[PDB]
Symmetry: D3
Subunit: 175 residues, 6 copies
């Protein structure tokens, strides 16, 4: 059973579900909107080998980022052109990891699903590379797996980026 607006308000009120920060205006019919943080990670190894520790760089943006499809073949001129034309602070191609602003904690009787915002899906911008279910008992911010699949997309710091859908478990989990 998916929690309605009224249920989300109740579980937040009683601290069954922690959402920090919380804005009641982000509660929809059956979801909670989450927002985009200013910190991103970009990987800088040649391949991804999960048996190893991954090398990465951390980027923080002031206002906005332009996410280009892989193989957009960005040159120095092109990046400056985009910065001047679209007022973006950073221009990336391919995958970039982001984060929600929101920190959540789930109880033992709820699982949540992250999904990217519909308006961004309609411009072929994804912020999750999986169906996005989150274990009962989870604590943390949500890591966003951002990729553009058609043309470059501007993302703004603090914009609504996606939503959490909360489902009841049939029984409490042991975590």
């Amino acid at each position: 059973m998916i929690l309605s607006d009224k249920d989300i308000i109740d579980y937040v009120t009683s601290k069954r579900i922690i959402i920090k920060p919380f804005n009641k205006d982000f509660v929809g019919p059956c979801s909670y909107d989450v927002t985009l943080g200013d910190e991103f990670i970009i990987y800088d190894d040649e391949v991804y080998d999960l048996s190893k520790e991954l090398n990465y760089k951390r980027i923080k943006i002031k206002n906005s980022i332009l996410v280009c499809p892989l193989n957009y073949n960005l040159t120095e001129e092109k990046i400056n052109y985009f910065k001047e034309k679209y007022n973006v602070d950073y221009v990336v191609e391919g995958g970039v990891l982001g984060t929600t602003n929101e920190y959540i904690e789930l109880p033992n009787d709820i699982s949540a699903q992250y999904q990217g915002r519909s308006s961004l899906g309609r411009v072929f911008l994804t912020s999750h590379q999986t169906a996005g279910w989150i274990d009962a008992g989870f604590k943390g911010k949500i890591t966003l797996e951002i990729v553009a699949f058609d043309k470059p997309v501007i993302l703004y710091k603090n914009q609504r980026i996606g939503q959490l859908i909360f489902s009841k478990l049939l029984s409490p989990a042991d975590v």
Copy 2:
């Protein structure tokens, strides 16, 4: 709780869930198959800036469309070659928006999830760029976010393109 075949039939019969047009042969064990419309939208701005109104063109196909991966680098000869060889009316690379034929209306106690057809997923054709949950209270056709990730894929007007999975809400929503 996900609605079974029998539940979908009941909710359609009593107009709790509106599906127009409806075909009882499209009811599966726990989903309803939806079909591909003949109208598509292609964006024609340089980047996507959601703070602005987006420029687009509307395309209608007679029978079929060939959806090529981004950076397939289509030339005039290549497009004609594909049209002659595969009898497609239109050839696109990268993202294209489509629509279901079906118009739906959801009540305050149901949320639905769109998912693309399995047989199309197995040829790396996606028709949704998000997990695809639809708010309780929604009214409309479903916008399809179509991208091919391996080789070009032929899509046919009116083919089964994906399915709707309907879940009960824990409580009625206020929309």
Copy 3:
């Protein structure tokens, strides 16, 4: 309602849900981890036309596979370079189909969703091209639709690749 750890154990114990092979250590709070088989399929036609029978080749790996993004433009030297450097048995670009090791059977009152592992989503490796719901009554292994979206990714035979999330149906289905 999503099945918890305890529910999954119960339904496996009573053979309501078949999972072969089964490892109780793969039961999480509200999911079951599945693993990557050694057999893959690669398509070898020019385009995908689902009205036709598709031509493909079968590949079996000994230990590992390097999955490169589409348009990585692999040459003979580059493939050897990757094999020597990363000890992979096979190097592919674009889409490849895989399989879980696990064979499942779902009863008439359960639907399951496949999702790819979070740690792989964070390196822009996907193993499903759809939301991944599986009909009540399904019998089979799970076909994996593998694509890398950022850099090449090493996948290991038998690694945990994703998870199954099981939901109750509101009523039994007629399949």
Copy 4:
């Protein structure tokens, strides 16, 4: 989860729950009202030994019955008194069995609870003295076990007597047997 009005109507429409006769105005917010049949059974035995087939009398009322508490000590004179004064067809004391007019069939994913109606409970008249849950798979009319606990109560043929409350099962039941024809 308890079926609402909307659910009851759906399940009756698709023949998932059979109710014969069905009256749509008997659907409440989360229950279905049932009505009192005109046939009743009164046992005639000194003690009830379930190893036996009990002896009984059947009666059919033309319109109404007066049900008196146990030990009301009904003589022919008191019976005619009541019949004359209140125009009842029959006067009984102690337990009387009745039946709903309604015949039901429950699917393998529903259980139902019968309850006697509140307005009769308010005058200490019951039509069941157990909780009243009915197995998934059940097919039949509902047997009513009618007892008055304070003063005699008039009941009328075809009156609403109680309600069925329908609950979803967590999983489909084995209703105890399977039949495969062809």
Copy 5:
């Protein structure tokens, strides 16, 4: 699905379920305890004909009432006996109506079942003789139908008398009417 303590508290906090007065220490694992009011009704009629408005007496106890089984045959001498010996304000036999102190309102997605408390059931005292389900949408106090089935039982003003068990409906109910003002 039955609401747990956690759920009851949530629904009371947001005013989805109204309970007036509310005592948080009356929330159990999966129910809410209700308490006995000091006003009671005793009918005064030879038979109960629901076509009529029944005649009754209202009483208010200062602290306690002795409820005797039907046919206990209470004379003024036995009444004063009990009053003197057990310090009760009133002695009655047979059925007596009472009320909860608590006023409730149920939303369109909840039904509740009243049950008399176990410790009173253990001495054959009931405060309802039907199953006790209450419609979604209900607003009111709970009417208690009190009967002792073995020996007389002392009840006290404001004591916990029973519990409400709350269940989710599968879908929202049409509570039978809609009101649109502006």
Copy 6:
């Protein structure tokens, strides 16, 4: 949602619901049958004041008991009459407490309702006169409150007497206490 047979078996197998002794043939479509113990309690007090520990007698039947309605006025001669004629070990009138043979433990996500069996209800014999819901977290045998409302009824040691109906809670309950050892 009410547990089906399939669910009951699962929860007993994993020790989520304890039932001791367990008989798999007592699992019905959506309930578990329980059986009547051979020990009974009869109170010996003029009135029941819950502020006190009530006085009682314990009895153990070798095979069977005749339970008579209240005010059946049992003399030694009538008792031996019944004992001789129906071969019962004990004859009682009015309320008698019994117990299930079965000991249960409920987890924090389940509540159960006891109901007396239908075939006994059909002869106006009850083994509970409240709705019978049991808290999540409960551990124990089930106390039976047995009353016959029409004629005396024979009950036998170890007979099926009623059923437990198990419901999921919407959320886990605080069962009222937490114990942390090490």
